[PDB]
Amino acid sequence: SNRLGQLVDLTRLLAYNYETLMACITMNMQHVQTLTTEKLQLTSVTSLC
Amino acid sequence: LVSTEAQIQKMSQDLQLEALTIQSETQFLTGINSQAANDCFKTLIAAMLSQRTMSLDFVTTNYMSLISGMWLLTVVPNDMFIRESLVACQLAIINTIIY
Amino acid sequence: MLIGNATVIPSPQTLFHYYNVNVNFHSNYNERINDAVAIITAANRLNLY
Amino acid sequence: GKYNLILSEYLSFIYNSQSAVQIPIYYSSNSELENRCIEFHSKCLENSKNGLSLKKLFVEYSDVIENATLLSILSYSYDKYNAVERKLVKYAKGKPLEADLTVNELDYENNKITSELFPTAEEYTDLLMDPAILTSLSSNLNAVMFWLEKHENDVAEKLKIYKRRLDLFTIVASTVNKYGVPRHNAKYRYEYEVMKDKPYYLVTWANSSIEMLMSVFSHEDYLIARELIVLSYSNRSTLAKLVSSPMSILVALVDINGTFITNEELELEFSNKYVRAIVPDQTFDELKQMLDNMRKAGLTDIPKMIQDWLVDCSIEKFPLMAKIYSWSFHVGFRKQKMLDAALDQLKTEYTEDVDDEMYREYTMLIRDEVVKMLEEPVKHDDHLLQDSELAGLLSMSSASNGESRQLKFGRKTIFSTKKNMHVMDDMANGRYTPGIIPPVNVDKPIPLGRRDVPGRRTRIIFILPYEYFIAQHAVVEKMLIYAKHTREYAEFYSQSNQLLSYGDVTRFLSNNSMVLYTDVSQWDSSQHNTQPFRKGIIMGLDMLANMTNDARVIQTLNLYKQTQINLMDSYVQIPDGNVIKKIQYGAVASGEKQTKAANSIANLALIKTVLSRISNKYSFATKIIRVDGDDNYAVLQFNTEVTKQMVQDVSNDVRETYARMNTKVKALVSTVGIEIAKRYIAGGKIFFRAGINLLNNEKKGQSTQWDQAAVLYSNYIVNRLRGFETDREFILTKIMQMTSVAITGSLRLFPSERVLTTNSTFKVFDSEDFIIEYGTTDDEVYIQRAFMSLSSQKSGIADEIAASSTFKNYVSRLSEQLLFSKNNIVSRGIALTEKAKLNSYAPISLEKRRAQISALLTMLQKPVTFKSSKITINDILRDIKPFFTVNEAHLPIQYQKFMPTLPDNVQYIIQCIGSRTYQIEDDGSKSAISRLISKYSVYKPSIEELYKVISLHENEIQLYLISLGIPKIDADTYVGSKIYSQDKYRILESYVYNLLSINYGCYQLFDFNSPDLEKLIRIPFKGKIPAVTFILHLYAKLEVINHAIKNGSWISLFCNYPKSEMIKLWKKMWNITSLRSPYTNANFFQ
Amino acid sequence: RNLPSTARYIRPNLLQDRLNLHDNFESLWDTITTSNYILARSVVPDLKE
């Protein structure tokens, strides 16, 4: 609750870099549930947030 | 980035997880470090760009991980996450926090 | 007289272990039953006296 | 009643001459028979002093020979020098052994001739191979040869033992007879002039090899012994380190089927849990490389035993490994030089490439832990912090050995290492200055001591001034108090007398969990014990200083802080020949009041910091962390089931995340097992290390020839319980030869079984191992009453030192620093108490104990004494015994084995009754009378002294307590409350327990609160006399247990004890006059 | 992980006791029941606190 502006900032930055890298794509970026799957430790998310 | 030891201080001393002892549960804090924040920052972006499905892997005792997972689910979409782990995260959140 | 404020829940892995153990015993039991019944029936239908 | 026969046969064998005559001496508790004994004595002395045959008189006085009790045997035989060779020539017709100088890395660690290494005696030193033990090589050879002679005609499995040990002794004696025997001097040292023409390391090799071959009972034992004796003759630096290394991996290969658990310091609760062993593949390659090095050194059979075991990895064949793990530590010490042993530690690689995110968290966690330890007393203004100076000044006796300094108490000169004596010296000459902490720098570097243990490296020891102790004492004691109840400190978590000796690993072992265990003994010169470690504590102290308002406490904190400032820059005196090196060493080691708890703190913080990095790649829940000195282990549980690859990756990540802090480690991850310094587990079963060299010691203590025999028997008991078994007859031969005393050049006395096995300050062993013996007879009572009269002796050195001026000044300053205006009523009490802690100084103890031994010998010679009614233990047992009745019983087997290495009889007991679950005060610490002493001091007072103090009036109790530093108001309050009547019983419980080794040896391993032992013990209840029923149940338990040990079978008991005798004994309770030696205890946990 | 439709799996035979060993085979049922007892002891949790 008291990381409010910092997380606003994070979300804006993340979305910005995502779109500016999306622009540098040439093949249709299509959505599928793949066989295997990248792991993500939520502790990393807590470290970031 | 923020100096870690500061966050370690305030998180540790207000959560007070040591007083919560069962009586061997050494409930000291776990990964808050750097070189995980930017690891996630790369993982999320690269997965949304690649459309690489990514899963969640957590421990429900660390309710802070889930308090951060709700942020994750808020900003990052849900069709990026495999349904089983997504459901697990949401369900831990509800059975522990919300309800 | 020696008990208090200490809950113990069986880990899921113990449960899965116990379930697979029981499955394997039960499957072995049924499979070997079918074996023995096959040979007995066959001996009786081939007049082996 | 058989020991004395082996004594007689040993005497007959060693002397063998017409001139060699043998003279028993007896005693009896009955007057008439005693005068007949005196007569026999007389006639024996005369006949010996007239060259007449003694064998004739032995028939005339058959009564004395049959019913009286033996004491000793004299022996008249002249010099007859060099008889060792005259016996040994026969056992040496094999080939001698050749060294191999190109085995050890160094030059002097080879087993070459002395003259090739020390041409001049002025540069000679026997210290690199000093046995440091008052027993000779010739003693050992005589004992071995006598054993070989008596077992020279048996035809059984015994002969299979005899051929093996004979071949081994042939291997030894061929090497010895090639050159000859070194001859001990009066001091049991070995001078240049005997070793001048012989190999330097022949003596240690000899003793260790004799010790091994006396511990051979099987074929594999023979293989191990033949394979070490022939290789330990040359390699003396890289052998125990080698064979003892693979064990740490083997424990990670044994599947659990059945487990033991811990709750509270000895609690157990077994589990039928099965757990597999998910070992990765690369550790097999490690193990293979280790066996390849093993073979490259010249080992063939023992790789084969380690190789054929891996096909099954079973735990039933596994004790061999444990046996092997103990066969490595009975090869000796690697007594190399102070310098090269320090340089094992003094190699440093400090880098400006480590994290800062890591060190800052580390420092902060140390800071926080310090504050958690010290917040409450610093705030509530506890007495021990305000008066920290006086507290340390009283507890100086529990300190380390300072550097030797020249004192003078009036008209003598002393070179004491005891810091209390240093304080006494410096007070007089105006030098006592505890506020000014000395530096430790170029201008005044620090000396060193070496903490050795075979099969490992040499650790170093600071030897500081006496200000550092005084500063650190109170704060470190409060830190310990905090750590008594903290789970994560395994050196201290207990209920005020025990340690977590069985470990606390097996709670959370499962298919989903793993455990990372790690040796942290090399982490003394490391970059994380320098600046950050010290600065964290300094920061915590700053916080605490701002967290108090009183000034004594802030001064104490500033002194501890300044100590940490000075230890941050620290130089180290290390000689090398004549010149002296001083090296920058701004780091940590032992030799301090602080090292233990602080290392535990720093290792805990370190692992908490590293363990939050695996979280970047894994999800786990930290279930438990433990840190105890030279090891540490953390268990952790996963969201799923474990695989080989997670073990591998976790280990590599741990190793590299320690490397990020510039920290070396052999990272070890497993699922079922650990190995650490003091213990190790395989398959849910705790084993122990049986590595106590008997015939060779680490350094030279101060005890006599006598007490080292008791120490040697205790070490024998320990190693036996551990698994390493030596033939007991050899031990008995050593005991008789070490208790033998020379009254002249040709007269020599040899005591008997009834002097050495009797509860006193002179007890040495027991007639049947694992069993103390008591006395139902007249005679044991008689000599015990006699010996108690003699135990109390004087020390003129202490008397003259305590009569000087400096001692008086010290007492005066103690007084006026504590209380005043009773200069002849209490101050004498405090002086009398300081006397109790001068005796730590060794020559005082030697004077007093040698006096006791002389008084003993001057009544072994002459007749015996009635001792004047002084009540003891056997007086009580004499009266309790005639109202028992035994009957054969039959208990079943319902308790589980979890210490396989025990002898089968002890295990049968454990396999029929339980293992202990509580622990009663061996030091009487929890007693409310002792919780004052543990509040204002550390001092022990022995339960003899307390047991007496309670027997006195309510007046001198106050003086005795005030003399121990306590004030007068709380002592008065203790007397007014009337808690001592509530505390007679606790004190007596602890007293009786200490007297009978219930918490010392095998009986420490047994549950006397059992329901199974109790149903045999059918003693009806009377009430209102607790001491009697207490001792009755205890003595009956001991009866049942000893019958079990010596015969296996069980029995019941019954004592319808009459009320008359209850009351007659109630008054004999608190008037006991008995005492037991410290040197006789055999702690199973060392 | 997501598993494709290319995948397969075999189902155990968990058909109950065709023999009724609890009907006058007491010596065998003793062994069976003992086996299940000792297995169940290996999964009951230890009372940690």
CATH of the domain at D618: 3.30.70.2480
* Token reading at D549: 């308002």
Other residues' Cβ atoms within 10 Å of the Cβ of residue D606? 26
Distance (Å) from the alpha carbon of D321 to chain A's nearest alpha carbon: 42
Q: B29 CB near a chain D CB, below 8 Å?
A: yes
- Helices B4-15, D357-380: crossing angle, 10 deg rounding: 40
Domain boundary among D569, D594, D619: D594
Query: Could A38 and B43 be called an inter-chain contact, meaning their C-beta atoms sit closer than 8 Å?
Result: yes
Q: How far, in Å, CA of D247 to CA of D285, rounded?
A: 15
Q: What is the 3-state secondary structure (H, E, C) of D409-454?
A: CCCCCECCCCHHHHHHHHHHCCCCCCCCCCCCCCCCCECEEEECCC
CA D666 to chain CA centroid, nearest Å: 29
Burial of D737 (0-12, 13-18, 19+ CB in 10 A): buried
Domain boundary among D644, D671, D696: D696
Do A and C make contact via 3 or more CB pairs under 8 A? The reply is no
Per CB-CB distance under 8 Å, the chain E contacts of C33 are 18-19
Closest alpha carbon within chain A to B69: A42
**Contact criterion met (CB below 8 Å) for D236 and D201:** yes
How many folded domains does chain D comprise? Answer: 8
Q: A2 CB near a chain E CB, below 8 Å?
A: no
Q: What are the two backbone dihedrals, phi and then psi, of residue D984, each rounded to the nearest 5 degrees?
A: -55, -40
Q: How many residues in chain D?
A: 1086
Minimal CA–CA distance to D857: which of D910, D776, D934, D790?
Answer: D790
Minimal CA–CA distance to D453: which of D298, D665, D610, D241?
Answer: D241
Q: What are the two backbone dihedrals, phi and then psi, of residue D741, each rounded to the nearest 5 degrees?
A: -135, 140
Q: How far, in Å, CA of D22 to CA of D57, rounded?
A: 13
Domain boundary among D979, D1006, D1033: D1006
Q: How far, in Å, CA of D509 to CA of D524, rounded?
A: 31
Q: How far, in Å, CA of D236 to CA of B1, rounded?
A: 55
Distance (Å) from the alpha carbon of D302 to chain B's nearest alpha carbon: 41
**Contact criterion met (CB below 8 Å) for D453 and D462:** no
Within D611-727, residue ranges assigned H as helices are 644-659, 705-722
Are D17 and D130 members of one domain? no
Query: Could D488 and B31 be called an inter-chain contact, meaning their C-beta atoms sit closer than 8 Å?
Result: no
C-contacting chains (≥3 CB pairs under 8 Å):
D, E
Are D504 and D621 members of one domain? yes
CATH number at residue D991: 1.20.120.1400
Query: Could D616 and B24 be called an inter-chain contact, meaning their C-beta atoms sit closer than 8 Å?
Result: no
Task: For strands D668-670 and D513-518, give the pairing.
Answer: antiparallel
Give contacts of A 17-46 with D, CB under 8 A.
Answer: 41, 43-44
Per CB-CB distance under 8 Å, the chain E contacts of D269 are 46-47
Q: B37 CB near a chain D CB, below 8 Å?
A: no
Closest alpha carbon within chain C to D641: C13
Q: How far, in Å, CA of D975 to CA of D964, rounded?
A: 16
- What 3-state class would DSSP assign to D53? coil
Considering only the beta carbons, identify the residue of B12, B23, B36 that sits closest to D487: B23
Name residue D635's beta-bridge partners: D515, D624
Q: What are the two backbone dihedrals, phi and then psi, of residue D775, each rounded to the nearest 5 degrees?
A: -130, 110
Per CB-CB distance under 8 Å, the chain E contacts of D273 are 42-43, 46
Resolution number, Å: 3.3
Q: D273 CB near a chain E CB, below 8 Å?
A: yes
Other residues' Cβ atoms within 10 Å of the Cβ of residue D8? 14
- CA distances to D337, D905, D993 from D1046, rounded to whole Å, are 47, 8, 21
Distance (Å) from the alpha carbon of D802 to chain B's nearest alpha carbon: 52
Q: How far, in Å, CA of D895 to CA of D298, rounded?
A: 44
Minimal CA–CA distance to A39: which of D649, B3, D607?
Answer: D649
Task: For strands D668-670 and D571-576, give the pairing.
Answer: unpaired
Closest alpha carbon within chain E to D260: E46
Q: How far, in Å, CA of C17 to CA of C14, rounded?
A: 5
- What 3-state class would DSSP assign to D754? helix
Are D854 and D797 members of one domain? yes
Q: How far, in Å, CA of E24 to CA of E20, rounded?
A: 8
Minimal CA–CA distance to D758: which of D286, D297, D1074?
Answer: D1074
* Degrees to nearest 5, angle at CA D458 with D452 and D460: 95
The DSSP line for D192-259 is HHHHTTSBTTHHHHHHHHHHHHTT--SHHHHHHHHHHHTTTTT--SSSHHHHTSTHHHHGGG--EEEE
Exposure letters D571-596 (e unless 16+ CB within 10 A, then b): bbbbeeeeeeeeeebebbbbbbbbbb
Q: What are the two backbone dihedrals, phi and then psi, of residue D431, each rounded to the nearest 5 degrees?
A: -90, -10
CA D310 to chain CA centroid, nearest Å: 35
Are D734 and D627 members of one domain? no
Per DSSP, chain D holds a count of helices (H) and strands (E) of 43, 20
Are D185 and D308 members of one domain? no
Minimal CA–CA distance to D369: which of D516, D595, D539?
Answer: D539
Task: For strands D680-681 and D686-687, give the pairing.
Answer: antiparallel
Task: For strands D1050-1054 and D1017-1018, give the pairing.
Answer: parallel
Q: How far, in Å, CA of D665 to CA of B6, rounded?
A: 29
Other residues' Cβ atoms within 10 Å of the Cβ of residue E27? 7
Q: How far, in Å, CA of D646 to CA of D426, rounded?
A: 61
Burial of D1014 (0-12, 13-18, 19+ CB in 10 A): middle
- What 3-state class would DSSP assign to D716? helix
Q: A6 CB near a chain D CB, below 8 Å?
A: no
Are D718 and D747 members of one domain? yes
Q: C14 CB near a chain D CB, below 8 Å?
A: yes
Distance (Å) from the alpha carbon of A21 to chain D's nearest alpha carbon: 25
* Token reading at D880: 């309790």
**Contact criterion met (CB below 8 Å) for D200 and D116:** no
Q: How far, in Å, CA of D260 to CA of D898, rounded?
A: 7
**Contact criterion met (CB below 8 Å) for D688 and D679:** yes
CA B68 to chain CA centroid, nearest Å: 5
Q: C36 CB near a chain E CB, below 8 Å?
A: no
**Contact criterion met (CB below 8 Å) for B22 and E47:** no
- What 3-state class would DSSP assign to D525? coil
Minimal CA–CA distance to D669: which of D1034, D278, D962, D959?
Answer: D278
Q: What are the two backbone dihedrals, phi and then psi, of residue D414, each rounded to the nearest 5 degrees?
A: -135, 150
Query: Could A31 and B49 be called an inter-chain contact, meaning their C-beta atoms sit closer than 8 Å?
Result: no
Q: How far, in Å, CA of D814 to CA of D387, rounded?
A: 12
Q: How far, in Å, CA of D796 to CA of D794, rounded?
A: 6
* Token reading at D27: 């005693």
CATH number at residue D304: 1.10.10.1990
Breaks (C-N over 2.5 A) in chain A follow: none
Q: C6 CB near a chain E CB, below 8 Å?
A: yes
Exposure letters D987-1011 (e unless 16+ CB within 10 A, then b): bbbbbbbbbbbbbbbbbbbbbbebe
Q: C10 CB near a chain E CB, below 8 Å?
A: yes
Task: For strands D271-275 and D448-451, give the pairing.
Answer: unpaired
Q: B11 CB near a chain D CB, below 8 Å?
A: no
Q: How far, in Å, CA of D366 to CA of D540, rounded?
A: 8
- What 3-state class would DSSP assign to D27? strand
Q: How far, in Å, CA of D180 to CA of D175, rounded?
A: 9
Considering only the beta carbons, identify the residue of E42, E46, E49 that sits closest to D274: E42
Burial of D480 (0-12, 13-18, 19+ CB in 10 A): middle
E-contacting chains (≥3 CB pairs under 8 Å):
A, B, C, D
Dihedral through CA D181, CA D185, CA D187, CA D193, nearest 10?
A: -80
Are D962 and D944 members of one domain? yes
Per CB-CB distance under 8 Å, the chain D contacts of C17 are 511
Query: Could E41 and D272 be called an inter-chain contact, meaning their C-beta atoms sit closer than 8 Å?
Result: yes
Q: What is the largest CA-CA distance in chain B?
A: 46
Per CB-CB distance under 8 Å, the chain D contacts of B59 are 619-621, 639
Are D129 and D213 members of one domain? yes
- Going across the sheet that includes D747-751, the strands are D21-27, D69-76, D747-751, D741-742
Method: cryo-EM
Name residue D407's beta-bridge partners: D414
Other residues' Cβ atoms within 10 Å of the Cβ of residue B73? 17
Dihedral through CA B54, CA B55, CA B57, CA B60, nearest 10?
A: 130
- Owning domain of residue D241: 236-253+279-336
Burial of A42 (0-12, 13-18, 19+ CB in 10 A): buried
Per CB-CB distance under 8 Å, the chain B contacts of A5 are none
* Token reading at D153: 């005609």
Are D263 and D412 members of one domain? no
Radius of gyration of chain D (CA): 31
Query: Could B57 and A42 be called an inter-chain contact, meaning their C-beta atoms sit closer than 8 Å?
Result: yes
Q: How many CB pairs under 8 A join A and E?
A: 10
Are D91 and D196 members of one domain? yes
Per CB-CB distance under 8 Å, the chain D contacts of E48 are 507
Per CB-CB distance under 8 Å, the chain C contacts of D621 are none
- Helices D1026-1047, D984-995: crossing angle, 10 deg rounding: 20
Within D622-723, residue ranges assigned H as helices are 644-659, 705-722
Q: How far, in Å, CA of D382 to CA of D388, rounded?
A: 10
- Helices D357-380, D531-545: crossing angle, 10 deg rounding: 30
- CA distances to D224, D235, D294, D306, D682 from D303, rounded to whole Å, are 11, 18, 7, 5, 20
Per CB-CB distance under 8 Å, the chain A contacts of B54 are 37-40
Side chain identity at residue D43, one-letter code = K
Distance (Å) from the alpha carbon of A22 to chain B's nearest alpha carbon: 6
Per CB-CB distance under 8 Å, the chain C contacts of E44 are 10
The DSSP line for chain B is ---HHHHHHHHHHHH-TTT--SSS---------TTTHHHHHHHHHHHHHHT--B--B--TT-HHHHHHHHHHHHHS-STTB-HHHHHHHHHHHIIIII-
Q: D635 CB near a chain E CB, below 8 Å?
A: no
Are D200 and D345 members of one domain? no
**Contact criterion met (CB below 8 Å) for D1055 and D935:** no
Q: How many CB pairs under 8 A join A and B?
A: 98
Q: C15 CB near a chain E CB, below 8 Å?
A: yes
Per CB-CB distance under 8 Å, the chain E contacts of B24 are 48-49
Are D838 and D828 members of one domain? yes
The DSSP line for D860-901 is HSS-----TT---HHHHHHHHGGG---EEE-----S----TT
Q: How far, in Å, CA of D101 to CA of D109, rounded?
A: 9
Distance (Å) from the alpha carbon of D611 to chain A's nearest alpha carbon: 13
- Going across the sheet that includes D668-670, the strands are D620-627, D632-638, D513-518, D668-670
The DSSP line for D143-205 is HHHHHHHHTSS--SHHHHHHHHHHHHHHHHHHHHHTT------TTS---HHHHTTSBTTHHHH
Q: B25 CB near a chain D CB, below 8 Å?
A: yes
**Contact criterion met (CB below 8 Å) for D486 and D500:** no
- CA distances to D757, D856, D1034, D1066, D1067 from D784, rounded to whole Å, are 11, 12, 21, 21, 20
Q: C33 CB near a chain E CB, below 8 Å?
A: yes
Residue whose token pair is 């014990």? D529
Side chain identity at residue D63, one-letter code = D
Q: How far, in Å, CA of D862 to CA of D858, rounded?
A: 6
**Contact criterion met (CB below 8 Å) for D626 and D632:** yes
Q: E11 CB near a chain C CB, below 8 Å?
A: no
Side chain identity at residue B2, one-letter code = V
